[PDB]
């Protein structure tokens, strides 16, 4: 019934009803005018001509390795390029944030209520005739059918980019600080009220939890020593709430910042590494500042680890994922003469797209062992069994699954994939093609264009009938990958903006924060500016084993 | 003992201890270098020469009325000037915010914990030898002594700028949405978690309170009709908590957004006016949007009232206070090509400086009556007695007290003034002169320079001994006024930055919000862009009585 149900307004124009069956588009600052904001302004037409497609740019970034080799070595050139990747991306994100699952129009409630995930696109109104607005049938295709026909893995498909298990578990661990759905409220709600990289997954969401985790000497976090090795403390010792099945012995109930991290030994591996890093940085700071107390050692270390985290995410993690020959750089100063909002709100869609479960192998291979999901889940004995060094060595060698390209979701986790589909609908997501437009990409004109093949395309076509009715989440996992890449166009073009915004939007990246004194001086500052996934493991894992995010 | 106790670093350089008795200043981006950031960079020296003092600029703004008359009528010129007043002010505020009462160094706790007021200057460390750091005696002068000698009113001193009671009560009402100290926690904590102009003082801090206040038809707020006039509903009808002495009859316990607003009839006057405005705007929107439901009518109206509020504050309220011949403008677009953070955190110091109780008269004069404080407080019968029209007429005629200049704090409220002194100290405020430097003003070199007279100066000198030990709050109320002005230099130069930042930092001022559709279309948008204190009163008060922030 809502006359905006067809999503009439193009180019980021906003639709507003002007009567029971009339609408109007607000084209303010879109660069277009006309009833649906589809008539371009002169200068807009120019820009459109001189604008290369994302696939073109991606090609240039992943080719001409010889040129990039030169560029990467000319500091002012590298800075110029990175500044452009930062700025071009962030303009795609609304900041201050706008919509959420309950508000398809701006409101103080949607702005002020931090318990919601924000929305890059507003929900389809409740009184629209179809799930996607006006197109398609009264009901989307059976989600089980979609799951089984195009999502579920038959044979394991490895990632051509060589992503390993160190990568997979880093992705899970890192993102699960800001992807923390409040299932008590619903899929559109979050428990991560910092809406970003605050390391609550190490330190805790709340002050009370943090204090239980802290030693209150030398700024350190509590820990225990088992077989000469440092591990997180127990629930019994700390009284912090953790999720564990009832059969887990108390001496194996490790207590960490994120209550869910005991559920996978790969998570507990990173939990342990970072715990160690924190206490390590505490020793460094105490040496520089024998005058400092516990609070200041703890707080400064946390700030340093936030910096290390962002550093590693950009220059190692995203570097690997991108396949760019251009060398990405973590440098807050690049934005100082630029318009940029030092804030962020986690988007529901960012969460949805990040369900990268195809990464998971059929078994987890540590040393001589090959563990099944059943044996791997909630099983910290495995970690104690082999130890950190062996986890790193093994996980660095084991290849992860390809994410886009279709049919690679492990059966063990099929319920999670079905829930991603069902909850997207529950949250009234607009279609894949609406999202594509929202991020300046060309709508797909057929299912075959989407997948780049014929078989899955045909199954999808029989299910959905209309490409404009296809759903974002299934599309992401079925999309034609970039050549020999882990992802297709839509994953990168939505993901990159959300990501860089949450990284650079952090307050430590602001001018008043980004200076040596913030981090206890030049020594603390250097820890951030030289951080890497390798140094993180070298300093904190016995034997300083070699590591990487790609299979060697 | 802390080597930074003496506030060694100048020009916004940051002090960090580097050993039990050594310190270092971080001069990053200050424009200076050297041990204490006192050596200017070349370009810094230039700028310093070409920079007029705040007193010079103030003079130019309050003179040459004939030129301003021309400028005010050249749209592009007016915009240019207002853009400059906006930008020059906001660079004085740290955003994202930094310190608070418990953290004299940056921390994630101080950044993330919204329950604290932020701090423009860090607190004096607990182990410093004197209250102000290293200067002065082990103890500040008796606050009762300061109160009595230089703060308390002997004879009422009227405001030379002609501020009236409409102004006084607007200031109280408006600011008490973001000045809401959480006395359960301490003076450095706030209950206003929106940290700005969110109109929680009309709508409530929390969703629960809001819903009790709402009618849930046509987007409106509950109300009652008494003698044909619209007033807020009762506590009995709504169950919203309000602070009222036990002797107040339930039918006089008006329920409004801000629990403390029943305490002064002048507050309840504005509460009633704004309640009316909201329901008024609801009627307008319903007429434009018969398709809209209650939620959308309510939320859109709230957004419109936020706009009206900022509009009136800049163009009427601040316009009056400034004494400028230049016509200030509320125009978000002025910042769109500028670097600016659409966020804000309420500063403790902004709260402290806004204790403008000298505004209060010895009696409140309504019609033929002259009420004492005793009779005026918690007495809503007076409002019912005379009605809104008579309140507006009377309060528009009654002159308010001068704030700076000394000895004009009403005795009835002496406990509040003493608390301002005592709580400042409790919160470990740095000295007046530190705050002056912090806002690019020249330190006062004597008490006589501060007051511009001899008698109070001599009393202050005997009390404090050293000008560098003088306190911010008492200094503000004792400072030499600008010629025939309500305030001295320090009030304006600290207040203006804090204020404009909270006004323009509101999300509705951001590009994605500042468009017609946000406000239900051109008709809702116009309500904001034509708002004035006179139109607010004219649309909402019977007879459309004349009003102004100044005596006629
Ligand atoms: C290691 C084995 C893993 C298991 C057993 C697992 C299982 C689960 C389960 C049961 C959920 C809840 C979904 C629902 O609401 O129905 C979930 C959520 C999620 N998973 Fe995984 N997962 C694993 C690894 C990963 C990996 C490698 C990633 C990639 C980054 C990932 C990304 C996510 C995300 C982003 C969520 C949503 C988090 C939230 O909103 O709270 N997971 N996972
Ligand atoms: C009209 C009669 C007034 C009375 C009886 C009054 C009394 C008080 C009292 C008792 C407090 C502290 C109470 C507490 O801490 O809970 C206070 C605080 C304050 N007053 Fe007034 N006042 C009046 C008018 C004004 C006016 C006209 C202004 C001008 C802006 C003003 C500005 C403030 C501010 C900014 C605070 C701090 C509030 C907070 O942080 O929560 N007051 N007043
Ligand atoms: C962010 O938005 C959330 C969604 O609106 C808010 O969560 C909801 O708050 C409501 C008000 O407290 C709850 O309403 C329920 O209403 C009935 C009738 O009065 C009562 O019986 C219930 O006690 C009351 N609450 C509950 C828990 O039943 C909603 O239930 C509650 N939860 C959800 C998911 O809607 C958040 O409050 C809001 N956050 C803030 C800071 O405002
Ligand atoms: C913003 O910072 C505030 C000030 O530090 C936090 O407020 C404090 O939280 C503490 C617990 O989280 C309370 O301490 C008390 O500690 C003992 C030890 O376990 C408990 O028994 C008490 O129950 C607990 N609380 C009380 C009321 O006794 C502090 O009292 C409390 N208030 C103050 C003034 O410190 C806020 O929690 C923090 N806000 C957020 C969002 O983190
Ligand atoms: C009213 C004209 C006198 C003003 C000068 C005040 C000198 C300080 O006098 C004080 O006045 C307070 C208020 O009455 C009293 O509570 C104190 O007991 C008294 O010391
Ligand atoms: O943070 C992330 O996961 C990513 C950040 C990222 C950022 C740029 Cl610029 C380019 C790529 Cl390929 C990126 O890859 C991913 C993504 F986008 F989500 F797939
Ligand atoms: O918001 C306020 O109260 C004010 C804002 C304000 C803003 C400018 Cl530009 C100039 C003046 Cl005189 C102002 O006066 C006051 C103040 F600063 F608090 F005294
Ligand atoms: C927008 O496109 C044209 C107006 O030029 C109109 O025919 C069309 O119906 C409008 N909206 C939609 C969804 O078709
Ligand atoms: C957990 O792993 C341990 C040690 O590797 C193994 O002995 C045990 O069988 C596992 N438990 C489950 C439930 O698979
Ligand atoms: C800063 O000024 C000079 C260093 O140039 C030095 O004499 C002084 O002691 C330093 N600090 C203070 C507080 O004086
Ligand atoms: C309250 O106001 C009434 C009526 O205006 C007045 O007569 C009365 O004296 C006041 N109450 C008190 C306690 O002063």
B191, B199, B506 from B204: Cα distances, Å: 11, 8, 18
Closest CA to B398 of B365, B356, B367, B374: B365
Closest CA to A264 of A413, A420, A373, A393: A373
From CA A372, how far away is CA A463, in angstroms rounded?
A: 33
Closest CA to B474 of B451, B494, B452, B446: B451
Element (H or E) spanning B25, and its range?
A: strand B23-26
User: What CA dihedral angle connects A65, A70, A72 and A74, to 10 degrees?
Assistant: -170
Asked if A219 and A286 count as a contact pair (C-beta separation under 8 A), the reply is yes
Which pair of tokens denotes residue B363? 């009696």
Asked if B181 and B187 count as a contact pair (C-beta separation under 8 A), the reply is yes
Question: Where are any strands of DSSP class E within B204-281?
Answer: 224-226, 229-231
DSSP string, A181-225: B-TTT-TTBBS-TT-S---HHHH-SSHHHHHHHB-SSTTPBP-EE
Helices (H), B215-329: 235-238, 265-288, 294-312, 319-322
Residue A126: CB partners within 8 Å, gap ≥ 6? A428
ω into residue A14 within 30 of 0, thus cis? no
From CA A320, how far away is CA A331, in angstroms rounded?
A: 18
A114: buried, middle or exposed (CB in 10 Å: 19+, 13-18, 0-12)?
A: middle
From CA B122, how far away is CA A219, in angstroms rounded?
A: 21
Which pair of tokens denotes residue B524? 């809702």
User: What CA dihedral angle connects B338, B342, B346 and B350, to 10 degrees?
Assistant: 20
DSSP string, A227-295: TTEEE--BHHHH-------TTS-GGG-B--SSTTTTS-HHHHHHHHHHHHHHHHHHHHHHHH-TT--HH
DSSP 8-state code for residue B549: S
Closest CA to B309 of B502, B77, B105: B502
The response to whether residue A50 sits with its C-beta less than 6 Å from ligand 4 reads no
Asked if A61 and A326 count as a contact pair (C-beta separation under 8 A), the reply is yes
Question: Which mutation among A103, A107, A109, A113 tests ligand 3's pocket best, with the greatest number of atoms within 8 A of CB?
Answer: A113
Name the residue in chain A with its Cα closest to that of B93.
A512
Q: Report the pocket of ligand 5 as residue ranges, CB < 6 Å.
A: B 148, 152, 154, 411, 414
From CA A26, how far away is CA A99, in angstroms rounded?
A: 16
Pairing verdict, β B14-17 and A369-371: unpaired
Q: Give B342's contacts in chain A (Cβ within 8 Å).
A: 95-96, 341, 343
Resolution (A): 2.2
From CA B132, how far away is CA B6, in angstroms rounded?
A: 8
From CA B154, how far away is CA B409, in angstroms rounded?
A: 9
Phi, psi of A439 (to 5 degrees): -110, 30
Closest CA to A404 of A487, A526, A292: A487
Centre of ligand 9 from the C-alpha of residue A247, in Å? 12
Residue A416: CB partners within 8 Å, gap ≥ 6? A355, A357
Q: Is A357 annotated as a binding residue?
A: yes
Distance (Å) from the alpha carbon of B198 to chain A's nearest alpha carbon: 8
Q: Bridge partners of A14?
A: A26
Give chain B's domains with CATH numbers: 1-41 (2.10.25.10), 42-552 (1.10.640.10)
Count the residues in chain A. 552
Pairing verdict, β B224-226 and B229-231: antiparallel
Residue A525: CB partners within 8 Å, gap ≥ 6? A515, A516, A518, A519
Pairing verdict, β A364-366 and A369-371: antiparallel
Experimental technique of record: X-ray
Asked if B185 and B221 count as a contact pair (C-beta separation under 8 A), the reply is no
From CA A355, how far away is CA A151, in angstroms rounded?
A: 12
Closest CA to B2 of B13, B15, B14, B12: B15
Helices (H), B409-454: 414-426, 432-438, 447-451
Helices (H), A332-399: 348-353, 373-376, 381-397
From CA B141, how far away is CA B162, in angstroms rounded?
A: 34
Asked if B308 and B536 count as a contact pair (C-beta separation under 8 A), the reply is yes
DSSP string, A403-453: SSSSS-B-GGGHHHHHHHHHHHHHTTPPPHHHHHHHTT-PPPSSHHHHHSS
Q: Bridge partners of B100?
A: B103, B118
> Are the beta carbons of A289 and B108 separated by less than 8 Å?
no
From CA A408, how far away is CA B403, in angstroms rounded?
A: 72
Which pair of tokens denotes residue B541? 């008060």
Distance (Å) from the alpha carbon of B335 to chain A's nearest alpha carbon: 11
Asked if B99 and B118 count as a contact pair (C-beta separation under 8 A), the reply is yes
From CA B513, how far away is CA A98, in angstroms rounded?
A: 8
A29, A123, B515 from A42: Cα distances, Å: 13, 32, 22
Q: Is B397 annotated as a binding residue?
A: no
CA count, 13 A, side-chain hemisphere, B152: 14
Asked if A443 and A437 count as a contact pair (C-beta separation under 8 A), the reply is yes
Q: Is B369 helix (H, G, I), strand (E, B) or coil?
A: strand
Asked if B267 and B169 count as a contact pair (C-beta separation under 8 A), the reply is yes
Dmax over Cα atoms in chain A, in whole Å? 73
Closest CA to B8 of B107, B118, B128: B128
Q: Which residue has the tokens 């130069």?
A: B493
Asked if A138 and A129 count as a contact pair (C-beta separation under 8 A), the reply is yes
Measured over the CA atoms of residue A190, residue A196, residue A199 and residue A205, the dihedral's sign is negative
A262, A360, A480, B464 from A168: Cα distances, Å: 16, 7, 21, 64
Helices (H), B75-163: 75-90, 108-112, 143-146
Q: Is A550 helix (H, G, I), strand (E, B) or coil?
A: strand
From CA A269, how far away is CA A274, in angstroms rounded?
A: 9
ω into residue B151 within 30 of 0, thus cis? no
> Are the beta carbons of A207 and B109 separated by less than 8 Å?
yes
The neighbour count for residue B275, using CB atoms within 10 Å, is 24
Q: Give A109's contacts in chain B (Cβ within 8 Å).
A: 207, 299
The neighbour count for residue B265, using CB atoms within 10 Å, is 25
The response to whether residue A444 sits with its C-beta less than 6 Å from ligand 1 reads no
Helices (H), B479-521: 489-504
Q: Which residue has the tokens 């520089």?
A: A288
User: What CA dihedral angle connects B132, B133, B137 and B139, to 10 degrees?
Assistant: 60
> Are the beta carbons of B14 and A292 separated by less than 8 Å?
no
Centre of ligand 10 from the C-alpha of residue B38, in Å? 9
Element (H or E) spanning A498, and its range?
A: helix A489-504
Closest CA to A384 of A204, A538, A234, A534: A234
Pairing verdict, β B99-100 and B39-40: unpaired
From CA A21, how far away is CA B42, in angstroms rounded?
A: 65
Q: Bridge partners of A130?
A: A133
Element (H or E) spanning A178, and its range?
A: none
Angle, to 10 degrees, between the axis of helix A294-312 and the axis of helix A265-288? 130
From CA B282, how far away is CA B296, in angstroms rounded?
A: 10
Residue B317 known to be catalytic? no
DSSP 8-state code for residue B17: E
From CA B89, how far away is CA B496, in angstroms rounded?
A: 7
> How open is the CA angle B45-B47-B49, to the nearest 5 degrees?
70
Which pair of tokens denotes residue B162? 């002609």
Which pair of tokens denotes residue B487? 């305030």
Asked if B538 and B530 count as a contact pair (C-beta separation under 8 A), the reply is no
């Amino acid at each position: 019934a809502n006359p905006c149900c067809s999503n009439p307004c193009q180019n980021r124009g906003e639709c507003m009803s002007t009567g029971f069956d009339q609408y109007k588009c607000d084209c303010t600052r879109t660069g277009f005018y006309g009833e649906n904001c589809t008539t371009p302004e002169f200068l807009t037409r120019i820009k459109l001509l001189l604008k290369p497609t994302p696939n073109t740019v991606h090609y240039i970034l992943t080719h001409f390795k010889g040129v990039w080799n030169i560029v990467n070595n000319i500091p002012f050139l590298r800075s110029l390029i990175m500044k452009y990747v930062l700025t071009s991306r962030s303009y795609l994100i609304d900041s201050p944030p706008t919509y959420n699952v309950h508000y398809g129009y701006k409101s103080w409630e949607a702005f002020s209520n931090l318990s919601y995930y924000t929305r890059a696109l507003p929900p389809v109104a409740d009184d629209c005739p179809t799930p996607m607005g006006v197109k398609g049938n009264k009901e989307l295709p059976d989600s089980k059918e979609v799951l089984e026909k195009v999502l579920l893995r038959r044979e394991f498909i490895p990632d051509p980019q060589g992503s390993n298990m160190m990568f997979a578990f880093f992705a899970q661990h890192f993102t699960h600080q800001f992807f923390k759905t409040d299932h008590k409220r619903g899929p559109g709600f979050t428990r991560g009220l910092g809406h970003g990289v605050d390391l609550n997954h190490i330190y805790g969401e709340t002050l009370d939890r943090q204090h239980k985790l802290r030693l209150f000497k030398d700024g350190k976090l509590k820990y225990q020593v088992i077989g000469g090795e440092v591990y997180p403390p127990t629930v019994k010792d700390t009284q912090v709430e953790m999720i564990y099945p009832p059969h887990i012995p108390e001496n194996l109930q490790f207590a960490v910042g994120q209550e869910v991290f005991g559920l996978v030994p790969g998570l507990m591996m990173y939990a342990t590494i970072w715990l160690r890093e924190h206490n390590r940085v505490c020793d460094i700071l105490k040496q520089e500042h024998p005058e400092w107390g516990d609070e200041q050692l703890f707080q400064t270390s946390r700030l340093i680890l936030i910096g290390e985290t962002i550093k590693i995410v950009i220059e190692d993690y995203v570097q690997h994922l991108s396949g760019y020959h251009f060398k990405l750089k973590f440098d807050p100063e690049l934005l100082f003469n630029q318009q940029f909002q030092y804030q962020n709100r986690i988007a529901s869609e960012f969460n949805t797209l990040y369900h990268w479960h195809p990464l998971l192998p059929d078994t987890f291979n540590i040393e001589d062992q090959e563990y099944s999901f059943k044996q791997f889940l909630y099983n910290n004995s495995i970690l104690l069994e082999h130890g950190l060094t062996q986890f790193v060595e093994s996980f660095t060698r084991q290849i992860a699954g390809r994410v886009a390209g279709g049919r690679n979701v492990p059966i063990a986790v099929q319920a999670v994939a079905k829930a991603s589909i069902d909850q997207s609908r529950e949250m009234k997501y607009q279609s894949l093609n609406e999202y594509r437009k929202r991020f300046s990409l060309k709508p797909y004109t057929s299912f075959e264009e989407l997948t780049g093949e014929k078989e899955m395309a045909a199954e999808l076509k029989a299910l959905y009938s209309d490409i404009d009715v296809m759903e974002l989440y299934p599309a992401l996992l079925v999309e034609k990958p970039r050549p020999d890449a882990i992802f297709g166009e839509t994953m990168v073009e939505l993901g990159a903006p959300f990501s860089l915004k949450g990284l650079m939007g952090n307050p430590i990246c602001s001018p008043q924060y980004w200076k040596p004194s913030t981090f206890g001086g030049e020594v603390g500052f250097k820890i951030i500016n030289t951080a890497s996934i390798q140094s993180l493991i070298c300093n904190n894992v016995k034997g300083c084993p070699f590591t990487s995010f790609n299979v060697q």
